[model samples]
Target: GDQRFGDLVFRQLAPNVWQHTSYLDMPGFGAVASNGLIVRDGGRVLVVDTAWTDDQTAQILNWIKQEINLPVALAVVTHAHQDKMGGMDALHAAGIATYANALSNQLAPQEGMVAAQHSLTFAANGWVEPATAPNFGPLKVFYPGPGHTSDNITVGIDGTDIAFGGCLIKDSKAKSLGNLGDADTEHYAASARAFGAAFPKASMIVMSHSAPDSRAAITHTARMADKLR
Candidate 1:
């Protein structure tokens, strides 16, 4: 079952997947809606990017437990941006494990960004590394170098070919790459291209903001990246 709380909505994308969105007054971005994902498998749900606050994260968790009838097993922070890791504290408080790339964990504090309670050191066999893509229960986390941020990564669900592009990919209606405050502009195009090569068969690309889902978002993002300074 899906639920909505004012501007916050958890819209189901598949039998066990949802695209979560919440509207908040972001610092320079103003009042805008950010996006995330929730993937459930075998009664366990994993959240990708936790809205933008503790209250918002709580609301999502409450709805999932009450309506979806499952416990949140883990959460993956795609980057260090507040839009991605703002709810890290809430997830940790709930005793939910959260994972982030080593770069994300290291750069977050330097960017004055929130940090996840746990770090995903890709040194292990089960965790994802730049050398190999590892599945985290129901989803696969892949890092395609740097684009939106040095630590940005993408999450994909098997069978669905549905990838959560976080901030690495742009929305269909994007006029340009939205924010470059933390971007590696010079190499963004290469990163975008790498992503396309890694997930060439992706049917649905879910972006961080703007239009939530699109069929050709990666290509559009690559085009925008090539045009960036």
Candidate 2:
């Protein structure tokens, strides 16, 4: 946390939902910002996604600890992207149980390998082992099929009304449905629709790389997915 810029701004999207948009002086990945979630259930905390840099991740950890003593028992990777899991090492070091779509672990080495490399090279300056999974929590991580990627899994939070849609939709400002070279905009559209239907009563929707918004965000992303088709 001390190593990252204090100049970045953090926003509270909801009661326990937080978003951090950080300053960028680095290159290659362009200016990147990430979001993480803090879910409180039964006095235990569940973290979704992560910060792009160690300092940023630490800041979130520090902030959360100050407000709540609940240690992070679970961390979910919405998909196989480094920007979303770059700070996993910090959480794991805290004895946090980490998880991802089982398929993402396998798909990452092939399609998203470069992204995984970029996180380490640009920030940590080296690679760290990916976290192993089925590690914690009971959220049903399901692949709606070769949507965002063959590994893409929409994280359906159990006992909570939230879904951390990772890189599922970059932002509402995105002019089109596709960004990443590997994103199957065609299939993602259907997956988005399915996820929306799957979580009919969701209170809010979050994307690992974007800010948290109301269920409207879910509808927006789903509509964007449908638009692409």
Candidate 3:
């Protein structure tokens, strides 16, 4: 199912996975679009990332409540970038529990971006840290190391072949690494390879700004990283 709300669009990409896209005007990129994932886990909805702003995030949640009729259980901010965590405050105000890696929390403030309300630290907390792979009902959050950002993570749904690669994985249309402002070029290819090895079964890889595709996206990203480096 697909619906439109002004500049935002929500479309279901699979049985339990939906993609939310918001349009924004980037200085150099012109009218760029940002992406997020909404996956149904056990009777609740989990947001992989957030829209570009509080209003867009509110729109997504409202549409989910009115149409999907599922409680938004939690949200995972894949990294500290604004496109991923810009809606942290809105999610908190809506009483939604959001989680992000400790590194993301530490870098977000330094990057002048808003961090998530709840921080998932290493073994100190329930998280296993760099090796932590926690299950949110049927969804799994795994950090494969630094690539797009120091704290970027990927989300996978149990029994499903979908994976939200966030900004760590590039889209099929991307010819090169789009944004290297906060990217770890030296470790980008290795990080992406780690993710592919970690979730080799994820056929549908969803990126933060492009359409979802198969494992080729991972290979494409790795190749691009190699070329850019």
Candidate 4:
């Protein structure tokens, strides 16, 4: 599909793994960073990070409903950024269960754009606040630790060895920690390292930005983190 800002595109990274890349207008953030993953488990699906606006998130929902009969069982908010956690309301309204790090839920009142941007874009469209978290079947979300921010979390599927690293790591050649606007600069790398240590067995690492990486790629992020300081 054609994108208005960054190179917004979608593709299946694995048999049941899907990705939606959204363009970030943020100055230094890559033009091709995405909100990330949609995983189909058996008959249900799980979305990693929802997009910046309801429209884009809605488009994703439309695609899921039209392409698969399964309901959205769970959506994980890796962090509290609007670009990543912005679509929570949309999924929550549909009754999707969201697995978020405890910090994310607490900080969202202060940081989530889905709550702030909702009225800016959706109230006019008669958009209502999502009543409850969405449910995507049996897939359960486990939060490893805070990485991108004190509120950040790395998401992992219960039985599958797949995980969502959020923005704690980047696969597209980011040289340093990049930005620390939302996180405590001192804790960024340590938090990321903690998440990595906690889930060392994951076979594939999905991110909110950039392509999915193997364990090696996560090593790359760790190395880059030291260089960033």
Candidate 5:
């Protein structure tokens, strides 16, 4: 099923999994789209990435409550960008269990998003598969040495074979690097390669800016990043 509410478009991509895309009007980029995931667990839902504004995030929570008849018990913010944490206040207001990577919590404040509550720390290899809160299942958190931003992290629901690449991987349709203001061009390609090796079974890779796509996009983004070298 698919529906539109405010600046968001909700589309079901799999059983108990829906994609929510929120749009924002960037000063120089015109209207841009950022995506999130809503995965149903029992009677509650887990949200990934908030809307572009508090009001929009509130709209999503409300829709999930009234229309879908589910409560949100958890959320994971993938990066420090406004598109990822812009609705932190809204999530906080709703009292949902929200989390982000440790580095994201530090950089998010610098981007004027939010300091955040819980966070996952990466290992020496820059990745961790940690058990999530009770009943929601575990999350595979991987930080591939910084591509889009120093704090960007990819998240995957354990055993689902679906991962959220955030901005670290470009959308399949994107021919350019999109945003490079804070990008690590020197390490971007390796980061992308690391991401490729991180998830071998990942079939549907949900993204932040464009459409949800296949794992091949990671390789494409790796090649795209290599162009900068």
Candidate 6:
């Protein structure tokens, strides 16, 4: 784990949660930032999502190993988007087991990302809990209809009240709904509401492409999506 690549930044979101940020250059947005989660449980770590590329994810792996002094016990790719799993190759190369929603694995290839080796099945309008940490705690994976993508899933730590909102959530400042070409516009509202409700205790919503915030992020996203309907 001596090697490194992209300059990823990590900061503590809670005693057991850390937020990792990485950047990728979008054609129209320039260098856009994306966020992920790292959960510390039982001496091992769980990476909620990957950096934007193999190189960047490799750096994350390195940082986790060197700084935290722990190996990744599991990795969850929240969706089929490249920003979430584009670095699947890196995690795989490091011999880390990966997972995602059942539908995400099916849609991953088209998005130019590798599918997680395992999958979680959730009700069409509900959610699922996976034994991500096994003995220490549970990792709740919720599928709130479809917003950012049909396969997007929001991740929560059992007792931590920390939610990884992925791209489905908007920062409180977002004035426009983002990248709707692949969205289910009507479900966006339902999904956002369900997301907020699923984690009624979540005070910190760790978001992708934005800094972590409170439920205000969910409210803002639902508001933007609500307009589309």
Best by lDDT: 6
Q: Per model, state how many residue pairs clash.
A: 0, 2, 0, 12, 0, 0
Candidate 3 structure quality by residue, lDDT tens digits, 54-125:
998898898788768988988888888778887788898889887888788888888777777677764422
- The residue-by-residue lDDT of candidate 1 on 63-93, one tens digit each, is 7877677888888889987778878778989
Residue 171 C-alpha lDDT in model 3: 76
lDDT preference between candidates 1 and 3, better one: 3
For model 1, what is the C-alpha lDDT against the true structure?
A: 0.77
TM value for model 4: 0.75
Q: How many times do residue backbones clash in model 6? A: 0
Candidate 4 lDDT trough over 10 residues, lowest sum: 119-128
TM-score of each: 0.89, 0.71, 0.90, 0.75, 0.92, 0.92
lDDT of 3 at 64: 86
lDDT per residue (tens digit) for residues 118-196 in model 2: 1110012111123333333535454455566656656556666666666665455655555557788667766666666
lDDT of each: 0.77, 0.58, 0.79, 0.62, 0.82, 0.83
- Candidate 3 deviates by what RMSD? 2.9
- Superposed model 5: Cα runs more than 4 Å off: 129-138
Can you give the lDDT of residue 47 in candidate 4? 81
Tell me how far the alpha carbon of residue 91 in candidate 4 is from the true structure, in angstroms, after superposition: 1.7
Estimate the overall C-alpha local distance difference test score of candidate 3: 0.79
Identify the superior model by TM-score, candidate 3 or candidate 5.
5
Q: State how far residue 12 of model 6 sits from its true place (Å).
A: 0.8
- Give the residue spans of candidate 4 off by over 4 A: 1-8, 27-32, 112-144, 158-161, 227-229
Steric clash pairs (candidate 3): none
Ranking by TM-score: 6, 5, 3, 1, 4, 2
